[PDB]
UniProtKB/Swiss-Prot annotation, chain B:
This is Adenylosuccinate lyase. Changing S430P: In ADSLD; severe. It comes from Homo sapiens (Human). It catalyses: N(6)-(1,2-dicarboxyethyl)-AMP = fumarate + AMP; (2S)-2-[5-amino-1-(5-phospho-beta-D-ribosyl)imidazole-4-carboxamido]succinate = 5-amino-1-(5-phospho-beta-D-ribosyl)imidazole-4-carboxamide + fumarate. Ubiquitously expressed. Both isoforms are produced by all tissues. Isoform 2 is 10-fold less abundant than isoform 1.
Swiss-Prot record, chain D:
Keywords: Acetylation, Disease variant, Epilepsy, Isopeptide bond, Lyase, Purine biosynthesis, Ubl conjugation. Changing P301L: In ADSLD; severe. This is Adenylosuccinate lyase. It comes from Homo sapiens (Human). Gene3D superfamilies: 1.10.275.60, Fumarase/aspartase (C-terminal domain), Fumarase/aspartase (Central domain). PANTHER family: ADENYLOSUCCINATE LYASE (PTHR43172:SF1). The active site is at H151. There is a cross-link at K398 (Glycyl lysine isopeptide (Lys-Gly) (interchain with G-Cter in SUMO1)). Changing R409H: In ADSLD; severe; most frequent mutation. The lineage of its organism: Eukaryota, Metazoa, Chordata, Craniata, Vertebrata.
Length: 456, 457, 451, 456
């Protein structure tokens, strides 16, 4: 709000409103009231003294939270969970709110619901990007381009084939995100140290009633599975599995955008339009943010390593930051990446220019093989070809002119039984190998199947 | 081998890790596998109609272990190439196969596929080790399932848990590691034959435009390698995302192990539990030190994957020769040392009982107020009456450094008339542990044993 | 702040209003205007057609910022700096033609970051010194009070409370020195142009090489810096950010160490936080994040291509502010902790008493030899009385009774009864109290002098 | 070459990569030798203070003679006492005055500090040598115009010498950091089990002054100017942080330089030294790989010091043996390879000139309009004419993949007749370099040469 105070650039400038809502106070305190409703619903079903009038008024007061009252009662009573019990019970039921449960019933189950929801926003966005990159890869599947190893010219590839290297990495990320989201489990009702003591007390020693309660709220929260063993909170290892797959996504994006930045210099490919000089500013923002995601991994790792026994509260402040800032960063990244993918501009003639410069240095083997087939001796042909290439290399390096190796093998009499066959031995398409067929097979076997559920 | 004391010894090779994992990352295994990959290539190429004879095949199959490391290093100096040097040395012990070795292949066919074979082997040696650790902790967790111990939140006295339940926190964290390790081993895919830029250009020229034969070759060497699946899309090498996926689980494992051993170290101070053999928990401190390094190593493959330009840059080669090996050798040492810890953790039941009885009356107060309504007495007048006696009892403990005298105060107090006779039953340690004992039994049978079953051998 | 939107907890819950302001858009764009004024003033002196009316106009409108207009212009122009040049030129109609004259974007953007970095360090420095000041008082007060030393977190030769506090102080002192050096050696970017060659300023002064050097000197002195970079690309070297976040990350490691000890002492009931050690848990949590952040500028500086790549911007806008707001929060909480550390001597005594006999056995032997005793016929006589006591402590879970077993054996009769002068807790503390004395007088107080 | 069988894992940092000097610094031979040298200094200093010690010569002559089997046997039977016994066998005359009243960390921890300082002393001259070589190159190419790069897009011309200065300045800040950390490195001395000097206070019979004189004497004998007053068992693990922080900062600088060389290699502007036609910057690639590891190693000591409980805990021992040794072996290798790259950088002036002429015309438009106004032309007419001709040239480059013909278009247009004679001056590369050459001379004389003078 105020420009007098520091404002998170991930919150006020970079990320989408959708992701910002999930990590807001309004959504957190709404979920708190939502978890209290489910607790009361399941407790009434199991025989605890709860009247239907207490339930209906909690149901009609889910999105009616007084912040001015809650903020000052938190300053008055120190504890934040109990401060929200008072505020809910004021617009309500008061006697049955949070009965038996501890602070971490709302706080910790909210985090897993927030976590599951945030992953649910990233998935269709990642698929959307992949889909748009897939169309680009299919369109440019046969357009030959100079391949790079050590960032030096190497055996030709296609523009579509190069794109599939990016697509694959994102397809592993989609799969990883989906797995982690599906594997996410509910804490349930566990108590102060995970022994379920206070809940067992209310049900007066009934062990089956506690287990039924643990299955009831888990299904109301939309989780398939619920933890058996926990300390106070869910194991902090969960936060590692989630941030690992995001950091991996960060690495992928960084590689993709660095490729695009290098292609922008070669003037072979640029970012979509709204001038001669164009900076790839969106890819650079992406690289910047991806880096943050890779850094973020050390936070949950260090945390879980130093949790003592059932729970130490030195996870609280660190998780408030790293978890939201992981998803806000990933969110910005995917919005930007989606923007970049919508009509990447390719300049074919610039690509054709770079090929015809380096191509003759790679086609030398084809020439000799064509001399042998006619009747020329390999040994003698190798010595007479490894001499015109050193001349043509000198012109390029020492003098800074265009490549003229093809001309020199047209003005040499020794290479007379090849002059008619030269413009076929230099067809760029006959140097791309199985590149176009690799795209074909990859998109149908691996890419399209994964995109199928996300068709919308 | 244990080299001269004049040179630096890497402690992960001799000082710590098991000779098995050391061998998987050795030059012998590396170059035996190189020659194996050349044998599978020749066999499959002979199947596809290339001029290779049975005699040439038997020659390669016989000389697989016959490696001259001295000559290969000397030829590497001259030829300025590691692979083409080993092609020459293999051709020297195989004079008839010399012509067909590495036909159509590029450097990474042997270089990069060997690292995939190394990864899968290295994971398959870690799994049984991680499972034996889980098993012995599951033995321990069953024995001590109903042994009350003071629970710690904020490392401060809280409601009672059991020793078995505390062990299950450790068990679960290692159980998710087992699942993650398995999943990564199964997801590993063979690179196969791809050529210098992944376009299979060289092999397509060998079969002379025959696209079907090239894809046939790729499947053939993959099956011979024992891989269910191979990549369709690579540059020169398999995507360096695979390193991230592997080392992310080892780093995560390290975080769980570091937690387990920090917990054990703290218990050793409390005298509640100690390691097998004034004693120092050196082996838990050894585990912590190494787990830390295992967590640190994750930033390497992360950064490596982020700066790989196009189809490949060699700015990953040296880094991978360090991070991958060390991660597994570190991961190896940890689980060998952790296995020795889990085999016989010593519990001191009487020391645990002492700490419980000096903290229990402060959390048994609620049961008293509920118990006092049998007569009965008022809820609010009793809440303040027992509250102030705790203020006097906690003052002798902290401000004067003594023992808990709260029980002594209530027994002589005239106000607490009826409750006297049922106090020992009210302070029953088992009636504070909740469902801890039932949580232990269910966790082991529902989740632990089904996971450990495939490792009966 | 809005409840419907996410808010960075460091700005709305944790850090001080002082630190939050140094990283605000108000401070940022005011400094932009502050740097444009200096440039104009120096350009006038060097002979450019700028009137005092124009400078007077600029000096009057440093704080008069229209953010609404500045945001609308950036959407249109797709440029941060030019938008603010236009907005400043709107409330300064006469100076509009001379704002940002011959300058590049990074003259404001990059020099502002350096100004912000220096200012933020200048707020952390007094706060750190003040923490060290009160921890020094605590170290002097409890300098002689013996406490059980811990190696491997196991009872070892007893030290003193003040001595253990000095281990904390020494780490923080090193931080204070490292924060001072980084702030003092921090340099100004100055005027460098788009690629660091000063080509555009050279053209404005129509070739006059000396005038470009003077303009660089003048804006540096006006900014309050002692030194400027001679060599830069577009921006100051990103190595600078590494050095700053390195000292802060190291400070995080120190803070986490101090707060872990406090968290362990609270468990042992030997020391307490002023009120669960929740303040030390908040400190540990944030210190952890401060250590994480060092990897950002490291990766950022490693992949800077040539004269500059813009893949540093968004990351720095996150990692720099977050580091300082975190650091600020930590020190604030550490101040509160240091104001009210409560020691409980009696609990310390009790723990000492049940471990002192296990560490005093060597002095008993040394007092038995010259009293007429054998070196093995006494060592065995006491070591058996240590085996039975180790069972009472560990197998039975009771009190340590080696302080009881003296009358039991008639062998130790010459020892009756000059003790417990031999079991004096102060006689096992070594040079702990002298070491505290020297440390404060030679190393700590000289550092806290000019604060 | 060193020894090791191919049947076990041999760390490439020791056997394959680093130079023999650094390997010896972290070897067992140097570790145990320094132990005995520290034991000697202890006896000699205790002799000067009054303790019953006589001619010292025996320990002096038996420093090189170490039996590793005897030490390993006693290590299996009982490491410090295993070496007290081994050094107390081949020295029969003196065995009751070795390690007298000292703890396991007098040798083990002070050795760790003599190694660190030895390792830094090998690095310093090596880093100075690289700066010196690069500086020579920078002076030689200080007035050689090259294309400036921002966003890796064409920008205001700089010089080759100037770009080199950006690298030098990074390394110069590294040399400063290393000198400061090495000089401010303190000795642990004598402290005892928990750092109170109790064991020594007993054997000097309560003498305060004598304990403090022993601290100064072994500090002076070790080559240190200063000793710690306050330490626990070992020196504060903050020391590891500061050492590896600056090393991590060096790896970042090296990565930047070597990424630059690699990119220049693709532009064919600059190349690694000889000993064609395709050449790979494999040496710069090795450096980036190794520098990356060096940047990673920083979290090790960071995590270590943060979880040190009280006086000392030995969960640092295994981590420090790895991380410290690795960092200095990696730093050493990097600087050895970076010495190679510096030694005979190949520059291709004509390739550099070709790139400039392709990008300069677009940047030179301001000067052309200035020259046209200077002759009697209109500002608007010239700006519109130069606008239509620049967009025509941009199409030829982008859409057609041809050379930059902007100057040709100006040269054939009759409107530009007033400046046709001026064109070979208006587009002089040197006039676009700004003050680059002057910055090089000033930087080298005021910062580099003073900094290198002590290292001469």
């Amino acid at each position: 709000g105020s420009p007098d105070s520091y404002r998170s650039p991930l919150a006020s400038r970079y990320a989408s409103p959708e992701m910002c809502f999930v990590f807001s106070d309004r959504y957190k305190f709404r979920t708190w009231r939502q978890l209290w409703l489910w607790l009361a619903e399941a407790e009434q079903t199991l025989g605890l003294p709860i009247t239907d009038e207490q339930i209906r008024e909690m149901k009609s007061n889910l999105e009616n939270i007084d912040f001015k009252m809650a903020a000052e009662e938190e300053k008055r009573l120190r504890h934040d969970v109990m401060a929200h019990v008072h505020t809910f019970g004021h617009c309500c039921a008061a006697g049955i709110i949070h009965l038996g449960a501890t602070s971490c019933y709302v706080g910790d189950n909210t985090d897993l619901i927030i976590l599951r929801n945030a992953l649910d926003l990233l998935l269709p966005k990642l698929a959307r990007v992949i889909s748009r990159l897939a169309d680009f890869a299919k369109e440019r599947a046969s357009l030959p381009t100079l391949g790079f190893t050590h960032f030096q010219p190497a055996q030709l590839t296609t523009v579509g084939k190069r794109c599939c290297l990016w697509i694959q990495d994102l397809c592993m990320d989609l799969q990883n995100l989906k797995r982690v989201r599906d594997d996410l489990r509910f804490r349930g009702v566990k108590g102060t140290t995970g022994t379920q003591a206070s809940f067992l007390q209310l049900f007066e020693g009934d062990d089956h009633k506690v287990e039924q309660l643990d299955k009831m709220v888990t299904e109301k929260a939309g989780f398939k599975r619920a933890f058996i063993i926990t300390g106070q909170t869910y194991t902090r290892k969960v936060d590692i599995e989630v941030l690992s797959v995001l950091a991996s996504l960060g690495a992928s994006v960084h590689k993709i955008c660095t490729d695009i930045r290098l292609l922008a210099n070669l003037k072979e490919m640029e970012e979509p339009f709204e001038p001669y000089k164009r900076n790839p500013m969106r890819s650079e923002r992406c690289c910047s943010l991806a880096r943050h995601l890779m850094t973020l991994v050390m936070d949950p790792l260090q945390t879980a390593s130093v949790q003592w026994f059932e729970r130490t509260l030195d996870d609280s402040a660190n998780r408030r930051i790293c978890l939201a800032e992981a998803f806000l960063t990933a969110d910005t990244i995917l919005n930007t990446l989606q923007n970049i993918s919508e009509g990447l501009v390719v300049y074919p003639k610039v690509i054709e220019r770079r090929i015809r410069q380096e191509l003759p240095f790679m086609a030398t083997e084809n020439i000799i093989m064509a001399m042998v087939k006619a009747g020329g001796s390999r040994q003698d042909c190798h010595e007479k070809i490894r001499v015109l290439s050193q001349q043509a290399a000198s012109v390029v390096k020492q003098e800074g002119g265009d490549n003229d190796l093809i001309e020199r093998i047209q003005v040499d009499a020794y290479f007379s039984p090849i002059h008619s066959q030269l413009d076929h031995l230099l067809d760029p398409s006959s140097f791309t190998g199985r590149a176009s067929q690799q795209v074909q097979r990859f998109l149908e076997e691996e890419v399209y199947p994964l995109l199928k559920p996300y068709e919308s």
